[PDB]
Amino acid sequence: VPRGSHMPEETQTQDQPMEEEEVETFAFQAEIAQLMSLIINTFYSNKEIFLRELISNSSDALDKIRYESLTDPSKLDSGKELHINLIPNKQDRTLTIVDTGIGMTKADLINNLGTIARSGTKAFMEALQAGADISMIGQFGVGFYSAYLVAEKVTVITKHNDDEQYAWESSAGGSFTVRTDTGEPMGRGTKVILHLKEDQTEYLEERRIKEIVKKHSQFIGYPITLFVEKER
Ligand SMILES: Nc1ncnc2c1ncn2[C@@H]1O[C@H](COP(=O)(O)CP(=O)(O)OP(=O)(O)O)[C@@H](O)[C@H]1O
Ligand SMILES: [Mg+2]
């Protein structure tokens, strides 16, 4: 049956086998849930410090690369630059903080971002109740959750040398999921994707991002780059 030319629908290759992703749901530690609720549902005028916190954690992760190299000099062989990228997406209303730090293994996500008590949580909630600036969150060891000052939902994609890629995700309300992430390989590090609340879209603006990096994150110790989508 001679063919001279095939239509794209005819030549369209079979899909790869359908990937399976294991998803687990966890309760936040009680006080973490209480903090998240508090952060989410209280007005704070100094919300911008959320970025200082997430950049600080990227920073920490990036320092650990340097130190882990002292026991694991193999890491020295990586060609990836140690850096943070800030990626605002006006179309998706997301702000992404990407680092090339050490990343987090599956159990690191579960333990570090929600199941394990932080000892400063109760004091932080009390401080807030007595009218502390939200900025103080940095000194009470719960700074990650500042993400929820600006974000209705947070997704963390992460890849650590010792594990596969995972996605952590929470819209708060007391639980979070962790699933294997068989999607876009991201290489070692972590990507924190903030789905911004409708009225926190100033944090997609390049000038505003620049202002708060300059104000709050001047000692990263690693290049930070802001990716700005050309306006069409
Ligand atoms: N970008 C990132 N890369 C790797 N690990 C990250 C990360 N962001 C968060 N984490 C993990 O999440 C944990 C909790 O972060 P935070 O809530 O900011 C408290 P911390 O930064 O560990 O304490 P500290 O600021 O009192 O030192 C970190 O300890 C780290 O294990
Ligand atoms: Mg921190």
Curated annotation (Swiss-Prot):
Binding site for ATP: N57, D99, R118, F144
Domain of life, source organism: Eukaryota
GO MF, one example: ATP hydrolysis activity
Positions where N6-acetyllysine occurs in the chain: K64, K90
Quaternary structure and interacting proteins, as annotated: Homodimer. Identified in NR3C1/GCR steroid receptor-chaperone complexes formed at least by NR3C1, HSP90AA1 and a variety of proteins containing TPR repeats such as FKBP4, FKBP5, PPID, PPP5C or STIP1. Forms a complex containing HSP90AA1, TSC1 and TSC2; TSC1 is required to recruit TCS2 to the complex. The closed form interacts (via the middle domain and TPR repeat-binding motif) with co-chaperone TSC1 (via C-terminus). Interacts with TOM34. Interacts with TERT; the interaction, together with PTGES3, is required for correct assembly and stabilization of the TERT holoenzyme complex. (Microbial infection) Interacts with herpes simplex virus 1 protein US11; this interaction inhibits TBK1-induced interferon production.
Reported function: Molecular chaperone that promotes the maturation, structural maintenance and proper regulation of specific target proteins involved for instance in cell cycle control and signal transduction. Undergoes a functional cycle that is linked to its ATPase activity which is essential for its chaperone activity. This cycle probably induces conformational changes in the client proteins, thereby causing their activation. Interacts dynamically with various co-chaperones that modulate its substrate recognition, ATPase cycle and chaperone function.
Stated name of the protein: Heat shock protein HSP 90-alpha
Span within the parent record: 1 to 226 of 732
